[PDB]
């Protein structure tokens, strides 16, 4: 008899529950498991956020999970209630597909890592594009919400680390007539425009920009994933450059990698002395898991190089490092891949970029 250590998961379907079970079975096969051996405990998202918090207690923390994998579900339900409840006890949560930058805030999400980067980290790719194509003067348009300001904070950090941002313009999310904003950007000399916005806000920008004839030749538009997804694509100018996080939405892949990291971290944890068990259930327990913060340190320091989604490391916010992006270019109204960011390096492929105008 070895010691059974439960990993938890809130996942999107029963097919993905089975994938999680199977990943853990492989972790046990791959590892030496005479001392500790993992057990998979899992559940699908509940329809609302109270029911979900309760399910974490009743289904997961009742089984003394050392960690909880969490996916973004299908088709208003965030990881948040799982991060809240698990964090009450300092049980680490691993986000699989969530990409909002708010989950990088420690005050809000104590024990949260994720195997995908926040949207704001796309600035890392923009910046390498700016050096590559020698855009030294850019205008930055972002939405005045958390995600927009996250992208500005991140890019301005890279610029004040060269190329410069001639001006930064913010607009109130929801606004439909952005002619005022875009006329302010039109008057400046710089014709390279970077955008951070949600799907529907980017649509507003694209339209207004087209009215003011700012999507033609001379102008360059550099953008993220949200701003060329679904609706945003319907009105996007031709020539626009955008990004897609490779494997960003493959829940199966991120389950496989998250389990590999977590298994490694668990075995590394039990190399140390004085490891305590998590609390058995929520009822009557109000103390944090004493070993929670150590296990987080171990997770955060974890390196898995041979991962399905590439090279798994985490930065100081517990966000994925060395993510890989498709560099996309809207050509005759088709999203065409013109390159990848391979984690550190831009690699242009043989498909030629067509800029706005060309």
């Amino acid at each position: 008899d070895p010691k059974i250590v439960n990993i938890g998961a809130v996942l999107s379907t029963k097919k993905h529950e089975q994938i999680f079970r199977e990943a853990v079975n492989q972790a046990n096969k791959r590892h030496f498991t005479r001392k500790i051996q993992l057990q998979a405990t899992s559940v699908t998202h509940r329809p609302n956020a109270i029911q979900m918090a309760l399910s974490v207690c009743e289904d997961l923390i009742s089984s003394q999970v050392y960690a909880i994998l969490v996916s973004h579900p299908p088709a208003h339900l965030t990881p948040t209630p799982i991060s809240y409840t698990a964090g009450f006890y300092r049980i680490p949560v691993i986000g699989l597909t969530t990409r909002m930058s708010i989950y990088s805030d420690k005050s809000i999400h104590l024990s949260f890592l994720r195997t995908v980067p926040p949207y704001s980290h796309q600035a890392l790719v923009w910046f390498e594009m700016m050096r590559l194509f020698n855009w030294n003067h850019v205008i930055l348009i972002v939405s005045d919400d958390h995600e927009g300001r996250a992208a500005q904070k991140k890019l301005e950090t890279l610029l004040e680390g060269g190329p410069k941002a001639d001006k930064v313009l913010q607009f109130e999310p929801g606004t439909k007539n952005l002619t005022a904003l875009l006329l302010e950007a039109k008057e400046l000399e710089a014709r390279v425009i970077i955008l951070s916005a949600s799907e529907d806000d980017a649509t507003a920008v694209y339209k207004s920009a087209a009215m003011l004839d700012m999507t033609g030749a001379g102008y360059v538009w550099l953008v993220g994933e949200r701003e060329i997804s679904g609706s945003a694509l319907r009105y996007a100018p031709d020539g626009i450059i955008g990004l897609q996080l490779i494997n960003g939405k493959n829940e199966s892949a991120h389950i496989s990698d998250a389990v590999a990291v977590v298994a490694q971290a668990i075995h590394e944890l039990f190399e140390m002395e004085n490891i305590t068990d998590p609390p058995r259930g929520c009822v009557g327990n109000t103390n944090i898991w004493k070993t929670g913060p150590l296990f987080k340190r171990v997770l955060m320091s974890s390196k898995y190089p041979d991962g399905v989604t590439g090279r798994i490391e985490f930065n100081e916010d517990g966000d994925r490092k060395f993510a890989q992006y498709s560099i996309m270019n809207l050509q005759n109204r088709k999203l065409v891949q013109v390159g990848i960011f391979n984690g550190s390096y831009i690699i242009q492929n043989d498909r030629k970029i067509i800029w706005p105008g060309g």
Partner: protein
Amino acid sequence: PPSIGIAVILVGTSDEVAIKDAHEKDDFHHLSVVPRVELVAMNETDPKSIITRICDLMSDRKIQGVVFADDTDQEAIAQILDFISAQTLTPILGIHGGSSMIMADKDESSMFFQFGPSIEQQASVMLNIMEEYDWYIFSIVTTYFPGYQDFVNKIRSTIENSFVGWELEEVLLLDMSLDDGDSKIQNQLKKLQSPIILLYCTKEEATYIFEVANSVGLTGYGYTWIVPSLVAGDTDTVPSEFPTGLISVSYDEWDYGLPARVRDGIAIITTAASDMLSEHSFIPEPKSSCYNTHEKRIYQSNMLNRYLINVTFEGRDLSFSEDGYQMHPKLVIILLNKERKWERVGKWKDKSLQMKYYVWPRM
């Protein structure tokens, strides 16, 4: 006059009879609506216990609002209540204990209000203490506990605008979401030179930070620590690691006792409802359950908030802030003395700080 349900939840030993008999100013409800209060007891203050208790209340009876008191030092109770209040759009008042410990950045949909001073007001009070005794040179230490930015910025904003010779020497940020087996926090604390040190954290975090501070010689004479209400917390519970001479702002049931507070809670929720029924010929229907709040979203609102924050009762202004704190709290500056008991040494009332000693006492 129609009755509205008000649950009063009491965690830990408390005189239900002294509480019920104080609300005998129920013959002092004159409005469009009368309170139908029901005392519930609760034994546990984990998330599941608290959630299921309030949600069983809401389904077994017709609750319009909740008045919550507890006897613990657990600031996470505020956070749980705010989550429940925002999900179900029920008014909740944290009047005592952990439930009343500052929660920063309440949900936008929150109808959760707390008896106690804002984070920014305790910071301003802490600077008034320092101005009085000419302690102009100081440093800040915080964790990632929500509010710590609002605290540091309130300090910074105040002393930038001042013809006074403030000198903020150092601001430390301590990550206690990781273990301290690398002696990181010790190596951060080692950088403090200032004789005054403002510490913003939770009570359980202060316990550890003081233990480390002590072992690098930062607790004795020549070092004065000032902390906010929630670190002192329950004053009848003093961790051995707390230094003597620790100063604290405080609101912990000194002159404003529990029976009084439940009275004002029931008053605020009842007045509010009356003001809205007065003026819209309806009040929001209590949620039948919290397990069906994904459906009934478009039918629910935080409309009652405008009125919850503007109640005057028995000639006192019981207004709240948008941020969900009491507007005009009576505060007490306490000092941990040589016999490990918290001692009153000052009052704050009406923007005026009146301290007891002119020359600061020696422990």
